[PDB]
């Protein structure tokens, strides 16, 4: 690893600087290096890892969608070739993230908050692979299984307003609607998540209340689009 010679603390510090500088590819490289030191990640460090790769793959997904739309309309080799280039790079980033989760973040996650976070990430990165897949069936099943295991743990171990639990349910609902062709499942999950969070807000501080309601707004926004 190109980051093998840098101290763990220095990698984390530089990931935070890269975030402020909007240098997300650098941020992801620093956080991959930190993960590869073999120690568990704190909550803050898990958030840095997630932000970095979400931004990298987000740009790739946005580009792929533009190119796939151009390719569909035109139906020379250039559009297909360039779409394939972007697709391959996106798949490579997803495979890198999934590799970090499998070697060895998930197995070493020795409490529910960490394990849920990583299983949610696993679902997310299989979902991104599914967006470009044609197998697609196997990828969809891997995403669903990761998300469902995360949901089972989150329902036993976290309150309904916990932001990781909320974000997991949100993203699993998106999986159902956009990937699995299961819009009824998406709507049911978003609705139950929203209602159970609503009924738990009374337990929260002003700060946690703002945290939770921000994510609940996204559940509401999807339900408005889907119904």
């Amino acid at each position: 690893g190109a980051m093998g010679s840098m101290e763990r603390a220095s990698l984390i510090q530089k990931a935070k600087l890269a975030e402020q500088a909007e240098r997300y590819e650098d941020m992801a490289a620093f956080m991959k290096g930190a993960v590869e030191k073999g120690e568990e990640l704190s909550c803050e460090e898990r958030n840095l890892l997630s932000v970095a790769y979400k931004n990298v793959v987000g740009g790739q997904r946005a580009a792929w969608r533009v190119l796939s739309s151009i390719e569909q309309k035109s139906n020379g080799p250039e559009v297909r070739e360039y779409r394939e280039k972007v697709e391959t790079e996106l798949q490579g980033v997803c495979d890198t993230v999934l590799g970090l989760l499998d070697s060895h973040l998930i197995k070493e996650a020795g409490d529910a908050e960490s394990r849920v976070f990583y299983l949610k990430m696993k679902g997310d990165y299989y979902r991104y692979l599914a967006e470009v897949a044609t197998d697609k069936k196997r990828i969809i099943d891997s995403a669903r299984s990761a998300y469902q295991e995360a949901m089972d743990i989150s329902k036993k171990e976290m309150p309904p307003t916990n932001p990781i639990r909320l974000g997991l349910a949100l993203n699993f609902s998106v999986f159902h609607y956009e990937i699995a062709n299961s819009p009824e499942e998406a709507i049911s999950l978003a609705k139950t998540t929203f209602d159970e969070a609503m009924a738990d807000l009374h337990t929260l501080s002003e700060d946690s209340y703002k945290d939770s309601t921000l994510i609940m707004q996204l559940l509401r926004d999807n339900l408005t689009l889907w119904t």
């Binding site: 997310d124 974000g167 949100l170 993203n171 609902s173 998106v174 956009e178 926004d221 999807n222 889907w226």
Partner: peptide, 6 residues
């Protein structure tokens, strides 16, 4: 398009 976690 559906909105995922931000």
């Amino acid at each position: 398009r559906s909105l995922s976690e931000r």
